[PDB]
Amino acid sequence: LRLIHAVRGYWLTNKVPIKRPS
């Protein structure tokens, strides 16, 4: 698809703690 959009969708989705039951 793209680099930067894969990059940002990589770290922005990871640094965020998603342990909360959403």
Q: How far is CA 9 from CA 1, 3, 4, 17, in A?
A: 12, 10, 8, 14
What whole-number distance in Å separates Cα of residue 11 and Cα of residue 4? Answer: 11
Q: In the 8-state DSSP scheme, what is residue 16?
A: S
Secondary structure tally for the chain: helices H, strands E: 1, 0
- Does 22 show up as a binding residue in the annotation? yes
Task: Give the CA radius of gyration of the chain.
Answer: 10
Q: In the 8-state DSSP scheme, what is residue 13?
A: T
